[model samples]
Target: SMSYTWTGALITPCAAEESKLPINALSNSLLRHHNMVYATTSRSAGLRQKKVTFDRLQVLDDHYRDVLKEMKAKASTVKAKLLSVEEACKLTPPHSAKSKFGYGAKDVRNLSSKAVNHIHSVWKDLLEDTVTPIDTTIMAKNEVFCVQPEKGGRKPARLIVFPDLGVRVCEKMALYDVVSTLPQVVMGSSYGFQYSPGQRVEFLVNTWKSKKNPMGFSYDTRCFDSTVTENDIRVEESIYQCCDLAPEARQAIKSLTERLYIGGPLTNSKGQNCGYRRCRASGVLTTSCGNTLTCYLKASAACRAAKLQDCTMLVNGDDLVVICESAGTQEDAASLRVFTEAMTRYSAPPGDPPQPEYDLELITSCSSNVSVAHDASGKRVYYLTRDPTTPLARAAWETARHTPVNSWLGNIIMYAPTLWARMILMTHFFSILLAQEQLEKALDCQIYGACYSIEPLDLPQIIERLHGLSAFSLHSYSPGEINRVASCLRKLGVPPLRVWRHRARSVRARLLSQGGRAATCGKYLFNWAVKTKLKLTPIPAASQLDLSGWFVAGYSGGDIYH
Candidate 1:
């Protein structure tokens, strides 16, 4: 939406013929300094460039069969609803990419005469043509990762491509509801996002404890989406077809699968047709849902073949965690090797081979590690965490633009008890929002591709859903964590944690002295400020099935509160 001119170093001003200025001097210096710091930190951290590896084995038991049977039954009962044309079109984001057919997102949102006609025409074409696959434009996405400097400093540019506007509406009509509701129903507690960080940790620990001679490990697949074979795509399509739908809807889906879903042509930045893609596109309507289902199907089958003991699986897309009864060190290792062979045959090769861990707390999943830290009261607290790099990068961006979602906000809500999140991320972001007088503004963000308007006041409920009641009680931070936060602040050009603490104190007092939801926010979000902590007020919105259209009933498996 914003246009800019390239005014960098080496480009002289119109008036300057002999005299010149270093247009890129400052930026160049900054880049060099950044590289130096990055290199230094990486070396100090013992990070080395290494080839990514893949290998693993799987095992199955009676419990695995029962879970699979239950999942398949749930999936069979899911009745998918086809969205109306208008409803599908309305779900498109206001900032969604413009159509190559000469209509922008604004025109689409307003349902302009041209936009409506074009959308209708596209829908008609999809229904009629079942042979010709759609062509997608591809681009490189540069992102920042704030974890291990070696693993995350500079990410390999990711390839992303999306279908044109009219096709996107078609996608919503066919797969939006399916993707949103089906996976959770089928997977149960295994559904990754359904549980808060605390709940997830609790589930893993309890499940591990329940197992006799427990052995657990997390599995990662290399280039998971790219590895989606044509058969895999067709299998996903078949799964979709299992749901009862209108004749027209079913035909449209079949046609969509034959055309764009199975394979598509990839056009590069230079406008050259690089090639055709036969794998799953990262920017698709069903990417998440499809990946989860496909991985589960393959892994579930592999487990059966490997004969694992009382196995339990938790999968979120390509990330997987398996906790099962161990058969002794030598026998378990041998079984793991056999499990790896089965997985290889299934086409979901491991990026990292499974390393057994007897302790549930030692296993990591969905990038979260369950570890121990001390609270302000010096009580040893075990919580889930990952490096705060991505969140910090996003918070920095929020200081400037309309970020669809603030990862920092989501992290604070989900990891409020984590020493790093509370002392660093929460304080930094709140300070920034407060300083700019934008604390009351309802900023939009997404979870599972669904958009929501989040206000500062909603922190209590959001935190409750994502991090549980632990957000309020966890106070004080580890010294090493505090030092790291301070270092990150300096490196990223953000205010110190102390400054944010001061701001948090101000916001805390103001919120505590207020009424209604505002007071609830003060108690949950700023409990660390006062000597006597306030009781957490129940958020009425949490009970509703459709709060801001981001949540739904029957998805959480039970009541919102455990």
Candidate 2:
């Protein structure tokens, strides 16, 4: 009753279905939000953020308990037993249903008494209280990412509740088209036998703040919305997906992901089960195996297999009378002469597939040269070009491929922006590339860098590290800012130490304020480099480069660093 599915138009089965109608859209969001980037600093910030969130969580819990108490008190006061249809309508549905046999109006109600109460309880628990965002230190992280979101009409100035998190409120996903995209929940615990369904809980967001880094508008809710002149909406949308694992445990997933990316329908020793045993499933592991491999590249071989050929294309094309799934290769893009000749020689023959009624298409997308050609019946056929010559053309081709299958847009953009930033930061700061894991440990100081450069990296030890980050800052110029102002003395490229001064100073401050410990702040400021031998780049005189753009006409009243 709370939410409805748009694509399928089915009333959501909150309680009737197993584990609540899966938050399909939210699940897709989870897949997109699988990774978190963090800096290696004291766990104090991470713990502090969690602590603040938990504190608010407890308060909301107490408030909901009070509501339950009030509801129970009211439920106990009703004491009427109805005999006739009119009389039954006056009492509570439960009481009226209880008073009848299987014939009258009361009869049907009584017959479904058990189902009704169960639904009521589930609704009451899931929907009785308000659903709000968590006021954790994540907002500070959000602030660093401030930018305009494109989909929601420019970057959102504030956080937006993730759709899946919102589904947790209704105990069902009725708000978005999430079902087809959400992957099956991996339930059974490894190294053990027993199984549990999944964990469900309520959360409340208390404080409001901005993100330090905004990935993108359409993909990430954290981006500021330009549509509304006022600040953007901030609310938790869904549940976190996957699990947090150490470097060793994650190796398995990495291997699987790599295989999937290359081209999968990956065979397993145990038929289906995707090499792992499925605890609760119907069909044989082979035909109905849901475990799929993924890739970061555009639709090449493996990407085409799972996303194009195996899933959508073949499935739909076969229905449209197509004979076979096309075989494409990465080489097809580079060797235009050879590829065109081959395509010219072989094309699909037309034939009718089993049932064309429920046809669908899964297209891959990328910044490359491939596309999907859909016919009138909505059946998809592959589109390819001999040459991926230009950036625009290649990008167009990639879009054609991704349109159908690899459409995890929200998530893709969310993490991607940060990844790009990290990559840029790492190209220079090799000692700590905070793209996802390995750099995270170094940032956390878990793995001490003797020199703080990529030169000393150990191949075996280059593992992913995860820091429960409290604050994610980008280019805060404290001592560095001062160094720049003072004839650009401090080396632009070095990790500055996190002295008391830098932490205390806001991002607005261009220079570190703490005097005695001031020198230490430079170490944190410039990552992974020697603080000795400060060489300031010489600034050109007025004749060389124009400096007018750096000046503001009127708002020049605060401290120079500020």
Candidate 3:
């Protein structure tokens, strides 16, 4: 997406008579006119920036180090492969390999490719699962319980399984990409990325549409209860740096506070459940929250913790507790803080730790009150259960898991981490690029509004770093181990050629192809000049084979007899 450049406005004389009078200070007159009509008149008023200079070497070094740090942290969390330096080195060859195997090396060449692939896969998985470290003040971990379902039954659990972070292209994630491109398409941006005030930003949007999913099946038939399958995975979003939240969302919660606080404001007596209906506000009984916007929307933010636990952890009937709350005041804020503290401080079960809980708060606080909670009937609370046929049924949780149902919410939430990481990356990038000029620009204004940016990371490099830092890499077999095995085998007179031939055909058949058909497997064997391509493995010498027994003789004769 291209960055939207702001062109300056032109000032014209309404009548030629006003210009007929001689003006002594043209610059002064222009300045006076500018201050009244246009606060900033020049094209470069807010955007004139110092040139950006990047530390290519420093950035590359940091990229690797960052990846290593991510991998280490990820490995610590899960019971998975953790590759050491030797392992990393062993797999390094495939990254720069000349042949299908790396660097035309004879060592563990057959297995090196596999080792690299395994590492890559691990990297991707880890990146997707890992969450950014952030301060969740009013959001408690797992305080938001979802009542969803198992295969045929309802279960109560918290939301788990955040949005997947598969692709990390800068164009897909860069500042200009958001402001210039996203607004035309979607309404909001992802959450994790940083947003400075006054910035035009892009975010992800998830929506519903029925189609055959990637696994080649209609999502409704196999994974969902309905025909609609929400596509929540990917989107580019634009959010004006200013809080352009929904009007309902922006409205001060004064009415709620007022209704709750009858003793102080209008009524001489304390606020009771009876007064809730009599509040002067129109349709005050209506839920100010956006949950009722759509069933799919509600499910998108909801999670079936039990399903995730059952399917991902292979456990059921575990003592898992989930909760949900609407944060309306400082007390709710206090509750959220307490909730987060409880979870964070709580020790995981020995060995098999339960998945972390998820919390969601739909707030209408556009500078709303925090004092009314003391007067209201404590905090309004609801307990979700696995019981179906009720509002808080467990199947509600499953609504989030199945296709297109929770897709939009998932996409909105996915921004939290991706945006956070992207923010960190861009912060570093922009600080260096803009240098001292950064001070002139408001961080929020510049970041979300798409004022300027530095050299963005490439898709391949971003993907590589993201994967390398992922949790899966920590547990997988190291490349060094694979390499060591290859080296030892070669020293013992075993050749990759033998392995290759064994993979495709028997020993005698390989010999016949080489000797009888003059097949070559080395790099130069085939070219544009060649008419026939005889595929063969590059083995050591032809005389290395020793067939001494009758069985061996029969094996050797089979090639010729055939």
Instruction: Assess each prediction's global lDDT (C-alpha) against the native.
Output: 0.63, 0.19, 0.20
- 1-562 per-residue lDDT for model 3 (tens digits): 1001112221111112110112232222111121111111122212211111011110112322333343234323322122332333332222121222232322222435544454354344333433322110010011112212343221211111111111111101211112222221221221111221111111100111111110000001110111111110000010111223323221211221222111111110111111111111111111111101111121211212111111111000111122232233443344434332332221111112222222111111111101110101233221111111121111122222221122112111122112111222222222232333322231210111111111121211222222221210111222332343344334322234233323223322332344422222111111111234333332333223321121111110000110
Q: What value does the lDDT take at residue 394 in candidate 3?
A: 12
Q: Which stretches of candidate 3 lie over 4 Å from their true place?
A: 1-190, 194-462, 469-473, 476-562
Whichever of 1 and 2 has more lDDT, that candidate is 1
Separately for all candidates shown, the number of backbone clashes (residues 3 or more apart, or on different chains) is 11, 72, 44
lDDT of 1 by residue, 1-562 (tens): 0011111111111111111111232222111122222102111111111121122223434544554565567777778888876777677667677788889666776778787898888778878888998977655443334335554544434455567777877777777677778887777777675555676777787788899789987877776766566677777777777666777677888887888777777665445665566667767777777788778777776666778888888877777898899988888888877777767766667777888888766677887767666654577766777655456655544444444456666677667777657655665556555556566787665554455457866776777666556556775555645565567666655556566567677776665566676667666677776666666655677654334444331111010110
Ranking of candidates on TM-score, top first:
1, 2, 3
Q: Which candidate, 1 or 3, has the higher TM-score?
A: 1
Task: Report lDDT (Cα) of residue 299, candidate 2.
Answer: 11
List, residue by residue over 317-341, the lDDT tens digit for candidate 2: 0011111122343432333223222
Judging by lDDT against the true structure, name the best candidate.
1
For every candidate in turn, the CA RMSD to the true structure comes to 8.7, 27.9, 32.3
Best by the TM-score measure: 1
TM-score of each: 0.78, 0.18, 0.14
